[PDB]
Amino acid sequence: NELHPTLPTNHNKTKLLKSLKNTKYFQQTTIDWVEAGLQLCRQGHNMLN
Amino acid sequence: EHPYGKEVEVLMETKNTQSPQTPLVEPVTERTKLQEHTIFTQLKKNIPKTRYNRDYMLSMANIPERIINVGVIGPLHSGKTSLMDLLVIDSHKRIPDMSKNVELGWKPLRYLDNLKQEIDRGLSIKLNGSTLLCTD
Amino acid sequence: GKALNNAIPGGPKFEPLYPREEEEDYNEFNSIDRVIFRVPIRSEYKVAF
Amino acid sequence: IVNRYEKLLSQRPEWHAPWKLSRVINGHLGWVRCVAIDPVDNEWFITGSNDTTMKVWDLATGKLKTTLAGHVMTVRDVAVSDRHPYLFSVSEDKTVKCWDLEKNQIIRDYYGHLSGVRTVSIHPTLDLIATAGRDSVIKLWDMRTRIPVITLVGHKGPINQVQCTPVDPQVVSSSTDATVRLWDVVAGKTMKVLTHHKRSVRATALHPKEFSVASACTDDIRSWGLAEGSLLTNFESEKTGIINTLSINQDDVLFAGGDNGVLSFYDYKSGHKYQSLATREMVGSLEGERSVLCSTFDKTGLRLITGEADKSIKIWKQDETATKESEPGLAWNPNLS
Amino acid sequence: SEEEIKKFDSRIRGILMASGSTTFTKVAAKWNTSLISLFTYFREAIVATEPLLDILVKGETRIQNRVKLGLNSKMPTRFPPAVFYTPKELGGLGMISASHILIPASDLSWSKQTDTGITHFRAGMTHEDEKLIPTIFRYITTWE
Amino acid sequence: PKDSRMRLIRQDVNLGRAVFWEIQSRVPTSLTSIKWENAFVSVYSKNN
Amino acid sequence: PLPTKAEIQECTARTKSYIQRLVNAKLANSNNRASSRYVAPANLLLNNSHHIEVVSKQMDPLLPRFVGKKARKVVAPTENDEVVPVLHMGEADPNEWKIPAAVSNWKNPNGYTVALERRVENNTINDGFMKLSEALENADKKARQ
Amino acid sequence: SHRPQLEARSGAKAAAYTPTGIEHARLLPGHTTLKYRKSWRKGTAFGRGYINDMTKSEYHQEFLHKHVR
Amino acid sequence: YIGNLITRQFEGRSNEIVKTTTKQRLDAYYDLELRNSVMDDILEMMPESIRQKKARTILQHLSEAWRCWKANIPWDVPGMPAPIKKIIERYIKSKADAWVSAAHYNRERIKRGAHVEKTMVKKNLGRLTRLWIKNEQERQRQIQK
RNA sequence: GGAGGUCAACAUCAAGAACUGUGGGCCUUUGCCUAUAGAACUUAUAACGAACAUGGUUCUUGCCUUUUACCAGAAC
Ligand SMILES: Nc1nc2c(ncn2[C@@H]2O[C@H](COP(=O)(O)OP(=O)(O)OP(=O)(O)O)[C@@H](O)[C@H]2O)c(=O)[nH]1
Numbered sequence A: 001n002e003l004h005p006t007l008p009t010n011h012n013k014t015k016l017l018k019s020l021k022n023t024k025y026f027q028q029t030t031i032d033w034v035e036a037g038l039q040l041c042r043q044g045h046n047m048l049n
Numbered sequence B: 001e002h003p004y005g006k007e008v009e010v011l012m013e014t015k016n017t018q019s020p021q022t023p024l025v026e027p028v029t030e031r032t033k034l035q036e037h038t039i040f041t042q043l044k045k046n047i048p049k050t051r052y053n054r055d056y057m058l059s060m061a062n063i064p065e066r067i068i069n070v071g072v073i074g075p076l077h078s079g080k081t082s083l084m085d086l087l088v089i090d091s092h093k094r095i096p097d098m099s100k101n102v103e104l105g106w107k108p109l110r111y112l113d114n115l116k117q118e119i120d121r122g123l124s125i126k127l128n129g130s131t132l133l134c135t136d
Numbered sequence C: 001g002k003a004l005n006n007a008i009p010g011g012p013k014f015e016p017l018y019p020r021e022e023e024e025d026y027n028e029f030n031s032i033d034r035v036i037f038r039v040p041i042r043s044e045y046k047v048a049f
Numbered sequence D: 001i002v003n004r005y006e007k008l009l010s011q012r013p014e015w016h017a018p019w020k021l022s023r024v025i026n027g028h029l030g031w032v033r034c035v036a037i038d039p040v041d042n043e044w045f046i047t048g049s050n051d052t053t054m055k056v057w058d059l060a061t062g063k064l065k066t067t068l069a070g071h072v073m074t075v076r077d078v079a080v081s082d083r084h085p086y087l088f089s090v091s092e093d094k095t096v097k098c099w100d101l102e103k104n105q106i107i108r109d110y111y112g113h114l115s116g117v118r119t120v121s122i123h124p125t126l127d128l129i130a131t132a133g134r135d136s137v138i139k140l141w142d143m144r145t146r147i148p149v150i151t152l153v154g155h156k157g158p159i160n161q162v163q164c165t166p167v168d169p170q171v172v173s174s175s176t177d178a179t180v181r182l183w184d185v186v187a188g189k190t191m192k193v194l195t196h197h198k199r200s201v202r203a204t205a206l207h208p209k210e211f212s213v214a215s216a217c218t219d220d221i222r223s224w225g226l227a228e229g230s231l232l233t234n235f236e237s238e239k240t241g242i243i244n245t246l247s248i249n250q251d252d253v254l255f256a257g258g259d260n261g262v263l264s265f266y267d268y269k270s271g272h273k274y275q276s277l278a279t280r281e282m283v284g285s286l287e288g289e290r291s292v293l294c295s296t297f298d299k300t301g302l303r304l305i306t307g308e309a310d311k312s313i314k315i316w317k318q319d320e321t322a323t324k325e326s327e328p329g330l331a332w333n334p335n336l337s
Numbered sequence E: 001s002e003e004e005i006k007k008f009d010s011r012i013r014g015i016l017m018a019s020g021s022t023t024f025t026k027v028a029a030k031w032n033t034s035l036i037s038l039f040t041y042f043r044e045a046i047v048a049t050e051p052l053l054d055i056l057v058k059g060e061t062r063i064q065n066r067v068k069l070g071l072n073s074k075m076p077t078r079f080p081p082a083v084f085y086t087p088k089e090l091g092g093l094g095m096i097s098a099s100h101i102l103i104p105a106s107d108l109s110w111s112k113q114t115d116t117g118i119t120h121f122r123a124g125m126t127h128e129d130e131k132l133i134p135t136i137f138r139y140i141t142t143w144e
Numbered sequence F: 001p002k003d004s005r006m007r008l009i010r011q012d013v014n015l016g017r018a019v020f021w022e023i024q025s026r027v028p029t030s031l032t033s034i035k036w037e038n039a040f041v042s043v044y045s046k047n048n
Numbered sequence G: 001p002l003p004t005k006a007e008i009q010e011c012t013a014r015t016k017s018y019i020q021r022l023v024n025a026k027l028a029n030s031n032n033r034a035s036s037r038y039v040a041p042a043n044l045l046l047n048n049s050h051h052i053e054v055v056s057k058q059m060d061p062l063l064p065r066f067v068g069k070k071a072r073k074v075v076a077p078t079e080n081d082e083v084v085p086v087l088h089m090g091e092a093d094p095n096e097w098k099i100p101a102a103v104s105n106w107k108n109p110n111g112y113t114v115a116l117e118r119r120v121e122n123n124t125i126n127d128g129f130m131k132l133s134e135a136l137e138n139a140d141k142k143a144r145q
Numbered sequence H: 001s002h003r004p005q006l007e008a009r010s011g012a013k014a015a016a017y018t019p020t021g022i023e024h025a026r027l028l029p030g031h032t033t034l035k036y037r038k039s040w041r042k043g044t045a046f047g048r049g050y051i052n053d054m055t056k057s058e059y060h061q062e063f064l065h066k067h068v069r
Numbered sequence I: 001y002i003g004n005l006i007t008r009q010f011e012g013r014s015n016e017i018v019k020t021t022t023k024q025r026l027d028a029y030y031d032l033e034l035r036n037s038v039m040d041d042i043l044e045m046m047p048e049s050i051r052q053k054k055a056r057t058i059l060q061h062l063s064e065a066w067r068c069w070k071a072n073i074p075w076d077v078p079g080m081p082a083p084i085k086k087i088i089e090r091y092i093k094s095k096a097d098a099w100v101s102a103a104h105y106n107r108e109r110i111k112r113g114a115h116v117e118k119t120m121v122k123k124n125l126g127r128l129t130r131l132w133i134k135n136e137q138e139r140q141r142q143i144q145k
Numbered sequence J: 001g002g003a004g005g006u007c008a009a010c011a012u013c014a015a016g017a018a019c020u021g022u023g024g025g026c027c028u029u030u031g032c033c034u035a036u037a038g039a040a041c042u043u044a045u046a047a048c049g050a051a052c053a054u055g056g057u058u059c060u061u062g063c064c065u066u067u068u069a070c071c072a073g074a075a076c
């Protein structure tokens, strides 16, 4: 990992979320962590079904 | 051979000349990069600005009694080069080689080092001086 | 260590990076009769200098 | 119609000098399909092969510089770039491969031909590629992003030979439906059609100056003005069939390679044929293997380079004695058509 | 001699390519009938050759790696040498392992010249627990 | 290895190619073909 | 005449811009938030009476963009406006150029039954054999005697 | 019912279809920047070049003379 | 991945699907380019008319001449216009040279024993036995002459 | 007006040891020479990240029926 560097990507300044939150369709809140774990499990299971 | 035999050069070529790594179209390097062998500043406009007015120094050269030659010698890691650092960065007002790091430095700025091999080797190899005027 | 295909007794083992040593010109230069064996020339030399 | 025939007897065209055989270069294992020359320094060749390789020959001494492998099948066409240090090679493997001359490694692969791609030509000012082949379509490739930007629907059969021009029509194309189309790429449709060929047009060449093209067929090598698209001239040919390639010297000399092994040299202005040669096949070859697959002139135009089906490249030089003592060739006698 | 080394190696490759799935004891049987031939003919000489030792090792490790593919694994832990080397009468493959030993490694650069002797031993073949296994060349008297 | 291989010395080599030259001559090229390439010649003298 | 100079600096300009329009038109199409980094009312309808203003709608990123793009195949018509005249400038020849039928020993896939003679050397020895046989003959006689 | 081919598929057909928009592996952007140019002997019995072809060449008879043993 | 899986799940798989040449289908393509390349020439030598019948026929003569070249049989056709025979001799000489060179190359790839497929060993064996017998028959004839 | 924000947009971040502006002279804008002002962030056991993944092509190998999936080195 020292021998082959990377030197990442200028213009990468755009991130998935910073682009995503912009839209009408995403809303922000706080929540307990374990609750986010469980929700996301339920999410996934519906997706794969 | 005999089918031609006179003017015609009948040549059967195998293998190669010009081993395959060669560029075969030479990359044009417009600027000349020294940074590989040494680290040295080539422009007239980037030479540091010497708060004592270099022009006034060159005048001292007319007075033979005035100028003096001091060498600095001592065993390994006695601090020679990093001492000449103190003198220099005292004299010059703005040095392009200072990182914000070495300016408050954890790592000593070593001005008189000047060779790549002497940077990586951690040592000083070929002797290097400086000329400057300083007030007694 | 890697470029020279050498190991520090505790260091990592890599690939040759120059897989062919096999080419050897039969020649007088390095012949034993012309060499003086003093000190073994341990690896740590070859990594050191 | 006789008035035209008088108007053929006034001109007495354009003396030139003969050609002869300077050098023979063996060293390909298979046939030599295509040849292109360094557009800047004239220091070398790039020659395709039937063995899939490419062997870069030095023009001066004829020595072999390097070998460029990397195609699995025979290499039908090779073209070198002017403003770029790039080399675009193309084969029967359905792929147009870029080559970075600096480090000699494949950079880019362009994708999406249905089948073997037999012509590449590098548009002069646009950083484009023009590729064509048994697809029966011409693909204008964006050199930078590898996107087949434009596709030109077109000839009813395979496309043998394609060229590029800076002004209107920017692509000239020649197909085995025996037509030659002059393309308008921005709108993406044929600007002009030239049908006068009776069989497959297997080769074209652009005159380096007059802004015209020389088109080939079995027995009749015609010329064409670009722009308006008129016929310009004809070239007198008895059966030379088949014409594999054409090349145009900067002195307005028009070369024609035969499949019968005959080298038919012309003047470009007239249509007159001042010389016809016959190559020597080879030591162990067959009389069938004697033909001329490709050919080119250097930047100057004082030498000729012809890959032949006998697995050899030959270098034809223009004689320096010549003049009027005895040059004269067939001497401009034309039979009624 | 180098030639008949390469003949042996080529023959092992023969056993390998010929049998796609012959099951198991056929493979061990063939390799036995090959190796025993090689040793029994070459008996004394084999001691002094580096490449044929290396090729015995690659050969056996390769056939074991063939039975390992015979199920699914390369894994060392699943297949302790008891699996391979117990004679058929106990239900093991019964192959005859000549490759364990230890292989003289001495001085690549010099051994091109002096014949330095054996200064070092590279590990011939491996295991989880070492145990030991007898190797044929000990059980066949030398030619002298 | 090199040391214990056969050494290359003018007397030696010239003997070898001499012998092989004569026996090369004895057999006619029609019956068989004896090439210097396939052959091996060994010489034991003061120097080897 | 070759096409001057300031003529090509035009075609190159307009063509270059057009190709850029196609490329940029594509790089914004496909599926990559990555590939987009390499990249007006305008409507007078009828008499322009009601004008217009055109405004894009941001798609829900999860839902498919291009809700109607679905891979399907189409046969295109060829609309032929005009005819391109194809204008060009044997007897005993066939006796030269007539190709015979092709009959192989190896394959008869159809089952055509054809005569055996459709299915089915000159040089003599060399005097070397004469010489050799005679020499062995004679030397044999001599030896036996 | 195997047949030679007697034709090819004209790319014109594929030109009229609508694009799918699948993202391939090799079309991810790469190389994104161009580059511009500027007594014992007396008893013995007996006393004392390029051909063009593959099969009749010399290297070939070397080859088959060896690998056939 | 999942980008392709889902966009393919709504929009269907691409209809074009061109497929590149690789190790398995190579020889097929080589055949194909060859038979095409002979179609062109032997269509352009003939004076005018006939096509499809003489197409199929002449290409059959190609195949037969190749088989007879593997078998060392000289392949004389009792009649056939000589220039065609020039052409077919030319192309089958080409294919012959490429084929042989592949035989050498694969062999010296096997002697090193690196990643040769199970079949390529068998096939290469076949090509070598063919070539070896050709060398033999050559030697014997030239001993007669 | 000050302090802040797990807020946003637009710039800039790998190079002749390297930036920008300006004054003056020559060529004829570029470019060279000379004078002057200001240089945030990142760099010498070299770099924005005191951390550390994956992919594509091309070669060399390693497993070894073939392809994905892979073995470990290199270049781009
Ligand atoms: N504690 C302490 N260490 C110092 C001092 N000066 C230098 N060092 C350390 O000593 C080492 C030697 O300093 P340098 O001046 O760079 O080395 P040098 O004098 O050039 O040694 P040479 O290369 O042989 O001339 C450096 O790595 C410094 O970290 C000091 O004043 N105090």
Ligand SMILES: [Mg+2]
Binding pocket: B080, B081, B082, B123, B124
């Ligand atoms: Mg010092």
Ligand SMILES: [Mg+2]
Binding pocket: none
């Ligand atoms: Mg299969």
